[PDB]
Amino acid sequence: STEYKLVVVGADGVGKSALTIQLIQNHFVDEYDPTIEDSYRKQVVIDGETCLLDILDTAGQEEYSAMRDQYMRTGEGFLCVFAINNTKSFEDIHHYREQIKRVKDSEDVPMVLVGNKCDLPSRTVDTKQAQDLARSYGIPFIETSAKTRQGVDDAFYTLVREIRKHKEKMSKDGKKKKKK
Numbered sequence: 001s002t003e004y005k006l007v008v009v010g011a012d013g014v015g016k017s018a019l020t021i022q023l024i025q026n027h028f029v030d031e032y033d034p035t036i037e038d039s040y041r042k043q044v045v046i047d048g049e050t051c052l053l054d055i056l057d058t059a060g061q062e063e064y065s066a067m068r069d070q071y072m073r074t075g076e077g078f079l080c081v082f083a084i085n086n087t088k089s090f091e092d093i094h095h096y097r098e099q100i101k102r103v104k105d106s107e108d109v110p111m112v113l114v115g116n117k118c119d120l121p122s123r124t125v126d127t128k129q130a131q132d133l134a135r136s137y138g139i140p141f142i143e144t145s146a147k148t149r150q151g152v153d154d155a156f157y158t159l160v161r162e163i164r165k166h167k168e169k170m171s172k173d174g175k176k177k178k179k180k
């Protein structure tokens, strides 16, 4: 029944597409084909609810700011992807969260922090530093591999769950009403 708008964001090459395609098509894309923008639809059942997932897969780097602003306005939930062997991509997470909060003019935006490529031996970003970042934001953290598929379903489902909690909150939130 319910429709969720998920936006996958992150630096160049972190595996945004591979994750999405693992979720949708159940196979690992070995090729590196830079994204402009891709729109996907998946129907899953989560906690006994049929969810229509509208997933936007975004570019590592947008040439026009206005194109970034557009998906930051529309997205209900954001999957914030870094690669565990890419320190810069991890540092970029802060900037994505800030721009999203600016654009939403809001402190509460459902997000999940995703550390991808956990199958690699080339780690430069420690689980702990990533856990601590998520804890600071008040969001879930999940490590994944689009190659092995570890954590993939979980990352997306958790995001859906975060959106639900925010809707629940939003209703009762927070000083200007609100219900229950």
Ligand SMILES: Nc1nc2c(ncn2[C@@H]2O[C@H](COP(=O)(O)OP(=O)(O)CP(=O)(O)O)[C@@H](O)[C@H]2O)c(=O)[nH]1
Residues within 6 Å of the ligand: 010, 011, 012, 013, 014, 015, 016, 017, 018, 019, 029, 030, 031, 032, 033, 034, 035, 036, 058, 059, 060, 061, 116, 117, 118, 119, 120, 144, 145, 146, 147, 148
């Ligand atoms: N070992 C490993 N490789 C991965 C993983 N995810 C993606 N890759 C590889 O990294 C490269 C980039 O993957 P891709 O999913 O296209 O990244 P992207 O962030 O979507 C690229 P863009 O930002 O240009 O859209 C590909 O060669 C892909 O096979 C992973 O979990 N583990």
Ligand SMILES: Cc1[nH]c2cc(Cl)cc(Cl)c2c1CCN
Residues within 6 Å of the ligand: 005, 006, 007, 039, 040, 054, 055, 056, 071, 074, 075, 076
């Ligand atoms: C054009 C556009 N804007 C979006 C914003 C979100 Cl949050 C999710 C999606 Cl799937 C889209 C699409 C693709 C529509 N086919």
Ligand SMILES: [Mg+2]
Residues within 6 Å of the ligand: 016, 017, 018, 033, 034, 035, 057, 058, 059, 060
């Ligand atoms: Mg891509």
Ligand SMILES: [Mg+2]
Residues within 6 Å of the ligand: 009, 010, 011, 012, 058, 059, 060, 061, 062
């Ligand atoms: Mg990007």
